[PDB]
């Protein structure tokens, strides 16, 4: 039996990505940036390929690499450039064109897909593998019954009993 998110339109998205002839499209390095038509100094900047960790404030795991095959979780991020305050109002000003484009719009299923996008666009990239969660609990409090075990204070000595 096979049932891996088999009740939604994502079935019709996984295929249409493996249609023959279109599943083997490939370009040389930096070639997609030449035909993109954006200024060429944009590709002198550095990019980071990484999957963001779970927020500490909440316990849910949906925006992590646990659901990597279900949901795109890998991101492309750029270093910050200068910001200052507006003299009249105090609003935060910037001259960065890539200020929100990687964090809002570019999401990928795997690390290699984001690498392929960076390679064909000409961005130099560094890849950061996320830290793997550990599921095995401690030896103490491994199960619920270890809360009430004999490991709290040892086996009780029967020396204060009447008739000792």
């Amino acid at each position: 039996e096979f049932a891996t998110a088999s009740a939604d339109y994502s079935i019709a998205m996984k295929k249409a990505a493996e249609i023959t002839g279109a599943a083997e499209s490939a370009m040389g390095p930096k070639e997609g940036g030449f035909t993109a038509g954006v200024p060429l100094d944009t590709f002198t900047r550095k990019a980071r390929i990484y999957a963001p960790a779970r927020t500490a404030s909440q316990s849910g795991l949906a925006r992590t690499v646990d659901f990597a095959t279900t949901t795109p979780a890998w991101k492309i991020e750029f270093e910050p450039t200068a910001k200052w305050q507006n003299p009249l109002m105090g609003w935060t000003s910037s001259a960065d064109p890539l200020e929100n484009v990687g964090r809002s719009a570019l999401v990928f299923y795997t690390k290699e897909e984001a690498m392929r996008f960076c390679e064909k666009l000409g961005w130099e990239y560094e890849v950061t593998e996320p830290n793997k969660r550990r599921t095995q609990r401690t030896k103490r409090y491994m199960q619920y019954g270890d809360n009430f075990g004999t490991k709290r204070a040892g086996v009780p000595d029967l020396s204060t009993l009447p008739s000792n």
Binding site: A153, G154, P156, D157, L158, S159, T160
Partner: protein
């Protein structure tokens, strides 16, 4: 939780603060150390509920912050665990009460028998409601759940704190009318000892009943175990 204790946190009082002192006497310390020996040494914390009860008679019917801290030091446990136990259980008073603690049952088997009229009689006589102490410091009125005396409903329990640990008395008074509880309160106030148990029979044996919460109405009928008691007997355990 009980009556008279609306806070589950400590409130500073000139009578009740961290500067207040508590210490056991010699005989009470003997009692507490005898209680501790009932349990294993590495599980000495099992003794907290009887020790806190004994401390409650020692301190005069209620637990102060100093008494709880002394008990915490005595059993070698953190004070927050002692505060947890003392706030969890209904008998533990954490504010100062009177000399006699009058507790009336209000659960439905006592309620059908007219516990509300007994409460009305107590409030009309003593002049206080539930959760209050008299201006003389004699009586404190409280409400309780089912006390396991339902065949002799309606009933009142009265706790004696005028003699300390050695003369502590927790006495049930059962099968009551307004006249019976008024007489019991007057007998306690005058310095006598009212009779314990039911006011119209000995025990839970078949006899009459309180009709409407105002009048005992005796009724005759079949009674069991009226003859001679059974002799010792055993079958042949071999075969």
């Amino acid at each position: 939780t009980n009556s008279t204790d609306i806070f589950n946190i400590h409130k500073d009082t000139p009578e009740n603060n961290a500067a207040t002192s508590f210490e056991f006497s010699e005989a009470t310390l003997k009692v507490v150390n005898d209680i501790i020996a009932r349990y294993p040494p590495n599980y000495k914390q099992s003794a907290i509920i009887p020790v806190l009860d004994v401390t409650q008679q020692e301190n005069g019917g209620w637990l102060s912050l100093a008494a709880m801290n002394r008990v915490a030091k005595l059993l070698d446990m953190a004070p927050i665990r002692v505060y947890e136990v003392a706030t969890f259980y209904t008998m533990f008073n954490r504010t100062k009460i009177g000399k006699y603690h009058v507790q009336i049952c209000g659960t439905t088997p006592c309620r059908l028998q007219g516990s509300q009229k007994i409460e009305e009689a107590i409030t009309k006589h003593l002049g206080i409601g539930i959760g209050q102490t008299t201006q003389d410091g004699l009586f404190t009125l409280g409400e309780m759940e089912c006390m396991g005396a339902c065949v002799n409903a309606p009933m009142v329990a009265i706790a004696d704190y005028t003699k300390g640990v050695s003369g502590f008395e927790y006495i049930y008074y059962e099968d009551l009318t307004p006249k019976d509880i008024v007489n019991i309160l007057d007998t306690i106030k005058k310095g006598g000892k009212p009779k314990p148990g039911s006011q119209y029979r000995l025990k839970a044996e078949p006899a009459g009943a309180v009709h409407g919460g105002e009048k005992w109405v005796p009724k005759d009928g079949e009674t069991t175990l009226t003859g001679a008691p059974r002799a010792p007997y055993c079958r042949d355990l071999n075969a």
